[PDB]
Amino acid sequence: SGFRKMAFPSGKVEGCMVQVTCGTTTLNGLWLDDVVYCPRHVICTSEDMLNPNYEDLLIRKSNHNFLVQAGNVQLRVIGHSMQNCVLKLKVDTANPKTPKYKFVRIQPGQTFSVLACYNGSPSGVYQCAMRPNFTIKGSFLNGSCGSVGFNIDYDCVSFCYMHHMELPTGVHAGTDLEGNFYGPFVDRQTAQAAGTDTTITVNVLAWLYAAVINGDRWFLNRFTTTLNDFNLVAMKYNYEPLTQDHVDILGPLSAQTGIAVLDMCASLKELLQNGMNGRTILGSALLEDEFTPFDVVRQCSGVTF
Amino acid sequence: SGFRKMAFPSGKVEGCMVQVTCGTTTLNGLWLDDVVYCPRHVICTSEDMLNPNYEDLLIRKSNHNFLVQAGNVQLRVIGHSMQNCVLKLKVDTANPKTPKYKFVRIQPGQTFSVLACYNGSPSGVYQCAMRPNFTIKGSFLNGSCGSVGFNIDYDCVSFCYMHHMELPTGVHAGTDLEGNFYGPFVDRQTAQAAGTDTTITVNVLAWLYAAVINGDRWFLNRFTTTLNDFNLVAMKYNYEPLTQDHVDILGPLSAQTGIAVLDMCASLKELLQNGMNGRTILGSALLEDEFTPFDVVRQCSGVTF
């Protein structure tokens, strides 16, 4: 038993991380087949980030302006193309460690593992959630740009995030591997506002189910509630509205614990109105919303890849 | 910026995880060079775990009683030896993915990454701490035995933990890679008591420094305390006594934040006596003690391997 914030094994991604230097700046790139993906602001100087014309900048760059370095071997750039906010650098070598992969654009509330890299070298791996305002609360230092988020299903690496910038508030913003930003953010150094961050209600419920599975049951009660009356209370406390789709994915957890979803809702309602009163659930004093219902099912069953 | 419970890249360990089956039970093994390490209770049936005579049991087993399977290829067992509580199965093939490694016995309070595996297949990676009572609060399901903990320094994998059993209380116990148990535990299914679990004071202080680095400064105050008067308060709240050695390793963090260690101590003293009063530090409402002073320095500087 037990319950931990768990990340996917990162071995398959480690083999794809390369170092990209264009002119004076250096960040990480994702090397898949014979293409290197990286944030396009690699072609910027510090002065350019305020109001960059990425087209005009990229035009003055030539293929030999990009220094891709994989560990110690160096790749030859023979092509460069800009797809939205990512640069695609066609190289002369296919990565012999390219896993079965695909690019996916996740939805807010979903979780994924991040592999933090610096100079194309992996530093650490952690699990996070795409917030409802399309930011992430990660751990990034200068030169961590290029770091990617990912999920592993069986044997297929689904790349879903590439890190681009830190906002003045300390939160992080990036794109899918097609170069489209999550959220209304742009890649220039200007004051950018993220929306109100709400709590991922469906994930909290899944976490409460994990707690019941692991023996933490003090929060339960034999009241029930209505989906309607519960959402009224969720709104007041900045909680994402819960829908029938959210109830359905919770079905398997409800079946395993004998506790209907609406019963658990009535329990969560109490916790928001009355709080924890100094107690804990799964070692935490706050309500945790970075475990999806699938994450909980995975950890409590023993799924491998 | 930001701060996350971070684990080491697990790629180098993934390549060493094999499946071990002796008779009817199956668990994970660590394949390094031409040797497979696994918990020795693999040679037990469910009835044997109550009072096993591991010598007499192992004697009735022959080399071909052990089915080692790496992914899909199968290894040939040509030798078996028991070193304390781990089995060493000499095989006919050297792992071509053996990293630079070494076996280390860590001290209580140190952190390490765990790679949870099932059937020799990696499932997830998470960071934990060896508690002062020599247990760990992990995430293990039946068949997770054989899973190993590890640290990575530059290019050398230091293996420090192998998982053996779950205790009736839900905590976990295991050995070093030489087969010596952390703590007073044995590998039989009998009620075993772990000592009083105390809080890793030195780690809390390092975490408080991380918070100051990330902008959380509300807990600070310009009082100071004595090492003596502070330990009096630590004992009352089940906190590990702080020593001059603990102050020294905190030197680098003190230098980076301008806050002397004893000043931070006076801040922590207040938090224990008065609590958080509903606030948070680095997104947490509790005091976190699973970041060593080195972990904090690593994450806030950008060290790679």
Side-chain angles (χ1 to χ4, degrees), chain A residues 254-279:
Chain A
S254 170
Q256 182 177 348
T257 59
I259 302 172
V261 174
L262 280 159
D263 295 336
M264 194 65 84
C265 284
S267 293
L268 175 57
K269 169 169 173 298
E270 271 271 278
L271 282 168
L272 307 168
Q273 284 166 357
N274 303 131
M276 313 229 175
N277 225 4
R279 295 208 252 182

mmCIF file of all heavy atoms in Angstrom, chain A residues 254-279:
data_model
loop_
_atom_site.group_PDB
_atom_site.id
_atom_site.type_symbol
_atom_site.label_atom_id
_atom_site.label_comp_id
_atom_site.label_asym_id
_atom_site.label_seq_id
_atom_site.Cartn_x
_atom_site.Cartn_y
_atom_site.Cartn_z
ATOM 1 N N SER A 254 -15.400 4.174 -7.552
ATOM 2 C CA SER A 254 -16.606 3.977 -6.759
ATOM 3 C C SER A 254 -16.908 2.494 -6.578
ATOM 4 O O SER A 254 -17.304 2.060 -5.491
ATOM 5 C CB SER A 254 -17.788 4.683 -7.422
ATOM 6 O OG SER A 254 -19.007 4.315 -6.805
ATOM 7 N N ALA A 255 -16.723 1.700 -7.635
ATOM 8 C CA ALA A 255 -17.022 0.277 -7.549
ATOM 9 C C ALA A 255 -16.069 -0.441 -6.606
ATOM 10 O O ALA A 255 -16.473 -1.381 -5.912
ATOM 11 C CB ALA A 255 -16.958 -0.355 -8.939
ATOM 12 N N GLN A 256 -14.808 -0.016 -6.564
ATOM 13 C CA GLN A 256 -13.814 -0.687 -5.743
ATOM 14 C C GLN A 256 -13.940 -0.353 -4.263
ATOM 15 O O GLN A 256 -13.468 -1.132 -3.429
ATOM 16 C CB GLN A 256 -12.412 -0.322 -6.234
ATOM 17 C CG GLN A 256 -11.288 -1.001 -5.479
ATOM 18 C CD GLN A 256 -9.924 -0.669 -6.049
ATOM 19 O OE1 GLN A 256 -9.814 -0.116 -7.144
ATOM 20 N NE2 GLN A 256 -8.875 -1.004 -5.306
ATOM 21 N N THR A 257 -14.561 0.773 -3.914
ATOM 22 C CA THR A 257 -14.646 1.197 -2.523
ATOM 23 C C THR A 257 -16.057 1.132 -1.959
ATOM 24 O O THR A 257 -16.245 1.417 -0.772
ATOM 25 C CB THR A 257 -14.113 2.628 -2.362
ATOM 26 O OG1 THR A 257 -14.869 3.521 -3.191
ATOM 27 C CG2 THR A 257 -12.636 2.700 -2.735
ATOM 28 N N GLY A 258 -17.049 0.772 -2.769
ATOM 29 C CA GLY A 258 -18.417 0.756 -2.301
ATOM 30 C C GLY A 258 -19.009 2.115 -2.021
ATOM 31 O O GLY A 258 -20.127 2.193 -1.503
ATOM 32 N N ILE A 259 -18.305 3.192 -2.355
ATOM 33 C CA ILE A 259 -18.761 4.545 -2.061
ATOM 34 C C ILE A 259 -19.157 5.211 -3.369
ATOM 35 O O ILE A 259 -18.312 5.433 -4.246
ATOM 36 C CB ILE A 259 -17.688 5.360 -1.323
ATOM 37 C CG1 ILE A 259 -17.310 4.658 -0.018
ATOM 38 C CG2 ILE A 259 -18.193 6.777 -1.056
ATOM 39 C CD1 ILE A 259 -16.129 5.276 0.688
ATOM 40 N N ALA A 260 -20.443 5.526 -3.495
ATOM 41 C CA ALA A 260 -20.935 6.231 -4.668
ATOM 42 C C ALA A 260 -20.239 7.580 -4.804
ATOM 43 O O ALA A 260 -19.787 8.177 -3.823
ATOM 44 C CB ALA A 260 -22.448 6.421 -4.572
ATOM 45 N N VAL A 261 -20.153 8.061 -6.045
ATOM 46 C CA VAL A 261 -19.480 9.330 -6.301
ATOM 47 C C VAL A 261 -20.160 10.456 -5.537
ATOM 48 O O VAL A 261 -19.497 11.317 -4.945
ATOM 49 C CB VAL A 261 -19.445 9.619 -7.813
ATOM 50 C CG1 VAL A 261 -18.889 11.007 -8.068
ATOM 51 C CG2 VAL A 261 -18.624 8.565 -8.536
ATOM 52 N N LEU A 262 -21.493 10.473 -5.537
ATOM 53 C CA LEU A 262 -22.214 11.549 -4.869
ATOM 54 C C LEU A 262 -22.023 11.499 -3.360
ATOM 55 O O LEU A 262 -22.025 12.548 -2.706
ATOM 56 C CB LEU A 262 -23.694 11.484 -5.235
ATOM 57 C CG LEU A 262 -23.982 12.088 -6.611
ATOM 58 C CD1 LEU A 262 -25.287 11.578 -7.189
ATOM 59 C CD2 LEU A 262 -24.001 13.610 -6.513
ATOM 60 N N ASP A 263 -21.855 10.302 -2.792
ATOM 61 C CA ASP A 263 -21.507 10.199 -1.379
ATOM 62 C C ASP A 263 -20.160 10.853 -1.110
ATOM 63 O O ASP A 263 -20.008 11.631 -0.162
ATOM 64 C CB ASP A 263 -21.478 8.734 -0.946
ATOM 65 C CG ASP A 263 -22.837 8.079 -1.016
ATOM 66 O OD1 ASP A 263 -23.852 8.805 -0.960
ATOM 67 O OD2 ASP A 263 -22.889 6.836 -1.124
ATOM 68 N N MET A 264 -19.160 10.541 -1.936
ATOM 69 C CA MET A 264 -17.860 11.175 -1.771
ATOM 70 C C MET A 264 -17.973 12.682 -1.956
ATOM 71 O O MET A 264 -17.319 13.454 -1.246
ATOM 72 C CB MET A 264 -16.855 10.581 -2.755
ATOM 73 C CG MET A 264 -15.414 10.935 -2.430
ATOM 74 S SD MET A 264 -14.873 10.229 -0.860
ATOM 75 C CE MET A 264 -14.403 8.577 -1.371
ATOM 76 N N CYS A 265 -18.815 13.121 -2.893
ATOM 77 C CA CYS A 265 -19.031 14.553 -3.068
ATOM 78 C C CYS A 265 -19.509 15.185 -1.769
ATOM 79 O O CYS A 265 -18.958 16.196 -1.317
ATOM 80 C CB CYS A 265 -20.029 14.797 -4.196
ATOM 81 S SG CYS A 265 -19.326 14.568 -5.846
ATOM 82 N N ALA A 266 -20.521 14.582 -1.137
ATOM 83 C CA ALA A 266 -21.012 15.084 0.142
ATOM 84 C C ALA A 266 -19.906 15.142 1.187
ATOM 85 O O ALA A 266 -19.941 15.997 2.080
ATOM 86 C CB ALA A 266 -22.160 14.207 0.643
ATOM 87 N N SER A 267 -18.926 14.242 1.105
ATOM 88 C CA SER A 267 -17.796 14.302 2.026
ATOM 89 C C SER A 267 -16.901 15.491 1.704
ATOM 90 O O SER A 267 -16.494 16.238 2.602
ATOM 91 C CB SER A 267 -17.006 12.995 1.970
ATOM 92 O OG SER A 267 -17.777 11.918 2.477
ATOM 93 N N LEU A 268 -16.595 15.690 0.419
ATOM 94 C CA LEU A 268 -15.745 16.806 0.023
ATOM 95 C C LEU A 268 -16.404 18.137 0.353
ATOM 96 O O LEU A 268 -15.739 19.069 0.821
ATOM 97 C CB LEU A 268 -15.431 16.717 -1.470
ATOM 98 C CG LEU A 268 -14.653 17.886 -2.072
ATOM 99 C CD1 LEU A 268 -13.340 18.068 -1.332
ATOM 100 C CD2 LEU A 268 -14.420 17.669 -3.564
ATOM 101 N N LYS A 269 -17.712 18.244 0.112
ATOM 102 C CA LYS A 269 -18.455 19.438 0.502
ATOM 103 C C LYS A 269 -18.173 19.809 1.952
ATOM 104 O O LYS A 269 -17.850 20.961 2.260
ATOM 105 C CB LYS A 269 -19.951 19.206 0.281
ATOM 106 C CG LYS A 269 -20.855 20.272 0.878
ATOM 107 C CD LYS A 269 -22.284 20.109 0.382
ATOM 108 C CE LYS A 269 -23.236 21.058 1.093
ATOM 109 N NZ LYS A 269 -23.296 20.814 2.565
ATOM 110 N N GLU A 270 -18.286 18.835 2.860
ATOM 111 C CA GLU A 270 -18.005 19.096 4.268
ATOM 112 C C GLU A 270 -16.593 19.635 4.463
ATOM 113 O O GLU A 270 -16.385 20.584 5.228
ATOM 114 C CB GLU A 270 -18.204 17.818 5.083
ATOM 115 C CG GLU A 270 -19.615 17.631 5.602
ATOM 116 C CD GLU A 270 -19.821 18.282 6.954
ATOM 117 O OE1 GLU A 270 -19.456 17.658 7.974
ATOM 118 O OE2 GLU A 270 -20.333 19.420 6.998
ATOM 119 N N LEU A 271 -15.609 19.045 3.777
ATOM 120 C CA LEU A 271 -14.222 19.454 3.974
ATOM 121 C C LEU A 271 -14.004 20.909 3.573
ATOM 122 O O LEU A 271 -13.243 21.630 4.227
ATOM 123 C CB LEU A 271 -13.286 18.534 3.189
ATOM 124 C CG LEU A 271 -13.005 17.163 3.808
ATOM 125 C CD1 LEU A 271 -12.313 16.247 2.814
ATOM 126 C CD2 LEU A 271 -12.161 17.297 5.066
ATOM 127 N N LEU A 272 -14.658 21.362 2.500
ATOM 128 C CA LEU A 272 -14.505 22.754 2.087
ATOM 129 C C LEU A 272 -15.152 23.698 3.093
ATOM 130 O O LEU A 272 -14.573 24.731 3.450
ATOM 131 C CB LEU A 272 -15.112 22.965 0.701
ATOM 132 C CG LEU A 272 -14.630 22.018 -0.398
ATOM 133 C CD1 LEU A 272 -15.523 22.134 -1.623
ATOM 134 C CD2 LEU A 272 -13.182 22.296 -0.764
ATOM 135 N N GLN A 273 -16.354 23.358 3.563
ATOM 136 C CA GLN A 273 -17.059 24.219 4.505
ATOM 137 C C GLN A 273 -16.384 24.231 5.870
ATOM 138 O O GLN A 273 -16.319 25.278 6.526
ATOM 139 C CB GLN A 273 -18.510 23.758 4.639
ATOM 140 C CG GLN A 273 -19.390 24.130 3.462
ATOM 141 C CD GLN A 273 -20.709 23.385 3.462
ATOM 142 O OE1 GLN A 273 -20.961 22.539 4.321
ATOM 143 N NE2 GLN A 273 -21.560 23.694 2.492
ATOM 144 N N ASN A 274 -15.882 23.080 6.320
ATOM 145 C CA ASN A 274 -15.354 22.945 7.668
ATOM 146 C C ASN A 274 -13.846 22.753 7.723
ATOM 147 O O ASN A 274 -13.262 22.899 8.802
ATOM 148 C CB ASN A 274 -16.035 21.766 8.380
ATOM 149 C CG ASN A 274 -17.545 21.906 8.424
ATOM 150 O OD1 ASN A 274 -18.277 20.976 8.086
ATOM 151 N ND2 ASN A 274 -18.019 23.076 8.838
ATOM 152 N N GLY A 275 -13.202 22.436 6.606
ATOM 153 C CA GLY A 275 -11.769 22.242 6.600
ATOM 154 C C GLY A 275 -11.363 20.907 7.195
ATOM 155 O O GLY A 275 -12.186 20.039 7.500
ATOM 156 N N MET A 276 -10.049 20.750 7.358
ATOM 157 C CA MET A 276 -9.488 19.532 7.928
ATOM 158 C C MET A 276 -9.364 19.592 9.442
ATOM 159 O O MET A 276 -9.224 18.543 10.082
ATOM 160 C CB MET A 276 -8.108 19.257 7.325
ATOM 161 C CG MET A 276 -8.072 19.380 5.816
ATOM 162 S SD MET A 276 -7.280 17.976 5.017
ATOM 163 C CE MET A 276 -7.546 18.393 3.297
ATOM 164 N N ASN A 277 -9.405 20.789 10.026
ATOM 165 C CA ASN A 277 -9.367 20.948 11.477
ATOM 166 C C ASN A 277 -8.081 20.377 12.068
ATOM 167 O O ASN A 277 -8.074 19.869 13.191
ATOM 168 C CB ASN A 277 -10.594 20.298 12.126
ATOM 169 C CG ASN A 277 -11.229 21.173 13.194
ATOM 170 O OD1 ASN A 277 -10.809 22.308 13.421
ATOM 171 N ND2 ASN A 277 -12.258 20.648 13.849
ATOM 172 N N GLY A 278 -6.985 20.454 11.315
ATOM 173 C CA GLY A 278 -5.691 20.019 11.796
ATOM 174 C C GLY A 278 -5.314 18.594 11.461
ATOM 175 O O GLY A 278 -4.184 18.184 11.761
ATOM 176 N N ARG A 279 -6.212 17.825 10.853
ATOM 177 C CA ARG A 279 -5.905 16.455 10.487
ATOM 178 C C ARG A 279 -5.235 16.407 9.116
ATOM 179 O O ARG A 279 -4.944 17.431 8.494
ATOM 180 C CB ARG A 279 -7.168 15.596 10.491
ATOM 181 C CG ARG A 279 -7.796 15.439 11.856
ATOM 182 C CD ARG A 279 -8.551 14.129 11.965
ATOM 183 N NE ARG A 279 -9.997 14.318 11.965
ATOM 184 C CZ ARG A 279 -10.876 13.328 12.081
ATOM 185 N NH1 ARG A 279 -10.453 12.077 12.204
ATOM 186 N NH2 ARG A 279 -12.176 13.588 12.074
#
